[PDB]
Every structure is written in structure tokens, then in C-alpha cells.
Paper text:
In the end, we obtained a reconstruction of apo-SA at 3.3 Å resolution (with D2 symmetry applied during the refinement) from a final dataset composed of ~24,000 particles and a reconstruction of the SA–biotin complex at 3.2 Å resolution (with D2 symmetry applied during the refinement) from a final dataset comprising ~45,000 particles. Compared with the biotin-bound SA, the density corresponding to loop 46–51 in the EM map of apo-SA was missing, indicating that this lid-like loop is flexible without ligand binding. We performed this 3D skip-alignment classification analysis of the apo-SA and biotin-SA datasets separately, and found a rather small occupancy variance around the biotin-binding pocket among the different classes in each dataset, demonstrating unambiguously the lack of biotin in all the monomers of apo-SA and the full occupancy of biotin in all the monomers of biotin-SA. We noticed that even after the careful scrutiny of the SA particle images by 2D classification to remove all obvious junk or bad particles, only ~20% (79, 289 vs. 378, 987 for the apo-SA) of the seemingly good particles contributed to the correct high-resolution reconstruction after the 3D classification. Based on the location of each particle, the 212,105 particles were manually divided into two subsets with 134,606 particles in the clustering regions (subset A) and 77,499 particles in the uniformly dispersed regions (subset B). We immediately noticed that among the 44,326 particles, 35,676, accounting for >80%, were from subset A and only 8,650, accounting for <20%, were from subset B. The fact that the contribution of the particles from subset A to the best 3D class increased from 63.5% (134,606/212,105) to 80.5% (35,676/44,326) after the classification indicates that a larger portion of the molecules on the GWI were well-preserved. The maps from subset A consistently demonstrated the correct features of the SA molecule, whereas the maps from subset B were of poor quality. To further investigate the effect of AWI on the structure of SA molecules, we performed cryo-EM analysis of apo-SA on regular holey carbon grids without graphene support. SPA of these SA molecules demonstrated a strong preferential orientation, which is similar to that of subset B in the above analysis.
Numbering used by the authors:
A (entry chain A), B (entry chain C), C (entry chain B), D (entry chain D): 16 to 134
The structure:
């Protein structure tokens, strides 16, 4: 059940809606980008995973811009949905900011975020 | 001019179509995922960047699945479009495969890809 | 107290010995490199951190080679020692394997490891 | 010939001295850490690589602290020495700064650096 509202341990609220073809839409809120606004994501996942155990490998992208606030950056998560009694999404991510050619070494960040359904 | 057909130094062909709202669609071909097939991406970029020099921070996601071949993985690029006379997209990326809980340490890869318009 | 024996949640045993100049020596065991052998690390940390809260930013490197087994790879952790009543080391890492020029896209891995003193 | 003075395309000067056991010492200068000072590295590489083509997988660590200036950070490169007529070191890296628990999401950076012998 990849469709639903996912949370974090930090406090981020991740509302997603999967697709039959393999698309992935929803909204996103609640910092690393910027705390109090509602941002839009899009992404993809494979529709036919393995059945002798695997994770449904997915990923999405949030460009930090809406009608409230612009942060001139973009964040892309890349993880998998681990299936079980306890639903779990384990992701790496990358935050890329808009810099000049001189400051191009400090543009991209990295990290890890772990998602769950209950909060 | 972010809309168009982008290439690599490896040989990957990246056909993209931007949006006025901030969406990003197109196709993708030509390995790291798997060499000879045509894969679908989606992603986002900010619609209002800075004018006293910056890069348009973007990112997209390819789930390696189509009618020809499945690789059970997903790749997310996260970079910026550097504007000038010579158009340039400089990206980091992450390849996340579908593994079990035991092999969860070797699921995610990392790298860097540099894109251009001429080939 | 950065000097001592650190553990993981996976099961890796990390015995380290700090230095007054800023060096960092010890041993390492217990997979991602290869499970049952004893590998050698070296690394550095800054000797004068901040006192109005910070983490002692450190990092080290293990080349997976000893008298028992060779894996033709190297792993570099890069994190910080968060000070408190509960000692904590939070790290990113990179596993770089020895590949040819053709397979140079899949050489480097990435992940995250969280270290503690009690097991 | 891994022992010697390596350069970059940015301008960083990397003087290294290898070891027979597998150690790796030298100095480092010339930004991402901080521009005009001389920093100390340490690292490791495997002493017995493959002969049917491979890269000598290495890695090292610089803690940005000396008698001139402190930056409260650490950088770890993780790459391979590609052998040939044109010597080449291709690395990923991670810059980890000293942050509090609140700003722990923006501590680690990421990038890529490509090293050569001629400048």
C-alpha cells in the first residue's frame, strides 16, 4: 500500500498518490526545504517488482517553489518501499541549490530520511 | 532554453519537455539503467530563478521499467541548469535497486553526470 | 570521549584510538567490506571544536585488505561525534570498488551508519 | 605511480606519499576547505590490486584544522587510481561540518573531484 500519507521521525508530512502506469503525485510540507508551506512533488516507481522479496524501488522530486515562498532549490529522494506488516520507506536524498560557477562546489547536499505511516 | 534534447559524454540521450507550472516530462534511453530501451522520466524545476547569476535547480526520476525490460530500480538526478552561451546541466545522481533487508547496505549507488546539447 | 570501542545497529565493531595532534587509528571488523576479518583504518578529526554546541567533525578510511582476504575496495566514513550523556557518531559513507573504465559508473556506493558505545 | 604531487581542474594541490603497508600521508592546500593554508591528510589504499584491469581503490581524509585557521569540518575522498599512460584519480567526496542537533540535516555536502599530475 504505497498510496497514502507518510510521515517521518523529524516531522515531515508526505502525502502521496500512486498511479497504475507508474507515476507518483501528491504534496509535501514541513522543512528541509522550508518549514511552513505546501510544495508539490512528482516521481516514479516500478509497477512490477519481484515477489521472492525485494523493495519497490521508487523516487521523487520536489522543487521548492510555490505561491508562498521560493527557496531556489530542488530535492530528490531515491529509495525503496520495504513491504511487511510495518510499512517502511528508506531513502537517500540530495538538495541542490542555485549557485554561480564560483560556488559550484557547495551546491549539492546529501542525507537520509526514513518514512512511516503513523504519527 | 531547458526544453530540448540533451546528451552526455557517455552517450545517454535525454529528451525533455519543460512546463510553465514547473513540471518536467520526456523520455530517456541509453544505459546506466539498461542500454537499449526507452524509459520515462518525470521531475520538477523552479519557475522563477534569480537573475544576478544562479543555476535553475532541477531534478527528475526514472523508474527502470517499460514494455521491453524491467531492472527493478530507480534513478534520481539532482542538479542545476547553468545558463550561458554554452548550455550545461551538472548533476549528481542515485541508483536505488530493489534488495531484501539483509542486502540493504548495497542498494543505493551514487555518481555524477554532465549534460550538454550537442552530439 | 572519542577514544574507545564503538558499535553499530548492524553489528559492526569499531575500535578506535584518537590522537592529541588530530590523528585517528584503530581496527575494524564485521561486514559491509567483508564479514570475518580484522581491517585497519586511519583518519582525522579536529582538535579544537566549538563549545557553544557542535559536533566534532571527523572521518576515516578503511582499505579492505589484510592477510586473510582482499576485496579490492575502500570505504570512507564522514561524520561527526555528537557530545552528550549518550555518545553518538552519525556518518555518511562511500564504498568505492576497483572497476575498469567501462564499469566506472557502478563503482561507488553510498549509505549511512550510526555508531554507539553499548552492545 | 601513486606517489607524487597531484593537481585538479579547480586548482587544488594534493601532495601525497604512499606506503608499502598501505598507508597514505601528505599535505593538502587550496580550497573547498579554506583557500590559503596547508592541511594534513591521511588515508589508505590496497597494496595488491588486480592485473586484468582495475583501479587501485583508495581514499583519504582531511580535517580542516592547522595553526593558521580552523573550519570545524572534515572532508573524505573515496575513489580509485586508474592506471595508464595518463594517470587519473576519480573521486567522490563528502564535506561534513560541525552542527547542532537542530541543523543536522544540512551538515554533510557531496561532490566529485578529478585529479591529475600536470599543471
Amino acid at each position: 500500500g504505497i498510496t497514502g500519507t507518510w510521515y517521518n521521525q523529524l516531522g515531515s508530512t508526505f502525502i502521496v498518490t500512486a498511479g497504475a502506469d507508474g507515476a507518483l503525485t501528491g504534496t509535501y510540507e514541513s522543512a528541509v526545504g522550508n518549514a511552513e508551506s505546501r510544495y508539490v512533488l512528482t516521481g516514479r516507481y516500478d509497477s512490477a517488482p519481484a515477489t521472492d522479496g525485494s523493495g519497490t524501488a521508487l523516487g521523487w522530486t520536489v522543487a521548492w517553489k510555490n505561491n508562498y515562498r521560493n527557496a531556489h532549490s530542488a530535492t530528490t529522494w531515491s529509495g525503496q518501499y520495504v513491504g511487511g506488516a510495518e510499512a517502511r520507506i528508506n531513502t537517500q536524498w540530495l538538495l541542490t541549490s542555485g549557485t554561480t560557477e564560483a560556488n559550484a562546489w557547495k551546491s549539492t547536499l546529501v542525507g537520509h530520511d526514513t518514512f512511516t505511516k503513523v504519527k
